[PDB]
């Protein structure tokens, strides 16, 4: 009665069994294609690796500008296939810092530097890409470039317009110290304490 | 000790088009190009293997009289026919020709 509705199709997929939910998702894709929620519900109701990979490939062929579909496609394949999918997701959606961070983390340092440069050229106001580049530099053989990278990131944030609020930097330092990046975490903590006498 | 298994899950869903390998080995000068709406992948004519010092196309004179009547009109043989001539005419074992 009410076609081309994502919430009604999601409720019909959640209320029906999976053998009926597959046909309901096929009818919803035939009535209203390029839906990220319907494709995610179809990939979630597949209970297989190849069926979910085919559903993710169909969602990428229908709507390639979906970050959730690319995140669902990259998390279910091989890590080399995950990097090959994250490269296409960064080439199709340059405004996704999480896909660029996943592409830089799942590759070599010579590719991670180019991925961080492309993320800085595409999104200069992003602060998580610079923290990911600092963590990748601290995880490599270099140890003194993290402070210069943090200084360059602070200069780029001061020149772009994102002021230091001293609340997300402490969380980024805690996430870096919880993941084995204590040098960049200490540098971010010193940069937050320097911009954040007795009081 | 016996367990009822799923006979339909272990079977191949594609059948004749079921590819057991994930990657495909391509030659050196076999690049592809997407011109307009379709991708053309070319593979050139591969060079044949060079014949050895003791490997050549055996003529009909090396075949015995029991096999000479079947090869009427053929002066010489092929490379795969001469490389396995003793395994198909002089040997009665089970042969597997992947040609």
């Amino acid at each position: 009665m009410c076609p081309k509705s994502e919430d009604v199709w999601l409720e019909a997929a959640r209320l029906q069994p999976g053998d009926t939910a597959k046909a309901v998702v096929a009818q919803a894709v035939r009535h209203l294609p390029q839906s990220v929620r319907i494709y995610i519900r179809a990939a979630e109701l597949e209970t297989d690796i190849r069926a979910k990979k085919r559903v993710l490939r169909k969602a990428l062929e229908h709507v390639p500008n979906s970050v959730r579909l690319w995140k669902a496609a990259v998390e279910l394949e091989e890590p080399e296939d995950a990097r090959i999918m994250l490269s296409r997701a960064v080439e199709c959606c340059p405004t996704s810092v999480e896909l660029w961070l996943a592409l830089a983390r799942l590759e070599t340092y010579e590719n991670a530097r180019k991925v961080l440069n492309k993320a800085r050229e595409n999104i200069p106001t992003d602060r998580h890409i610079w923290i990911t580049a600092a963590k990748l530099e601290e995880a490599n053989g270099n140890t003194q470039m993290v402070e210069k990278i943090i200084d360059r990131a602070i200069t780029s944030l001061r020149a772009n317009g994102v002021e230091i609020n001293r609340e997300q930097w402490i969380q980024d330092a805690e996430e870096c110290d919880r993941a084995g990046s204590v040098a960049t975490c200490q540098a971010v903590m010193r940069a937050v304490i320097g911009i954040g006498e007795e009081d | 000790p016996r367990q009822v298994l799923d006979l339909e899950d272990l079977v191949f869903t594609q059948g004749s088009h079921f590819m057991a390998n994930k990657r495909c080995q391509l030659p050196d000068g076999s690049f592809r190009r997407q011109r307009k709406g379709y991708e053309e992948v070319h593979v050139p004519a591969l060079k044949p293997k060079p014949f050895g010092s003791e490997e050549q196309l055996l003529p009909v004179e090396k075949l015995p009289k029991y096999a000479q009547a079947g090869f009427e009109g053929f002066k010489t043989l092929n490379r795969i026919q001469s490389k396995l001539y003793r395994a198909a005419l002089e040997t009665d074992e089970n042969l597997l020709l992947c040609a």
Partner: peptide
């Protein structure tokens, strides 16, 4: 050598 993959075929199409 033209190596075919799923991600390259998804990005090219």
């Amino acid at each position: 050598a033209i190596v075919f993959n799923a991600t390259s075929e998804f990005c090219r199409t």
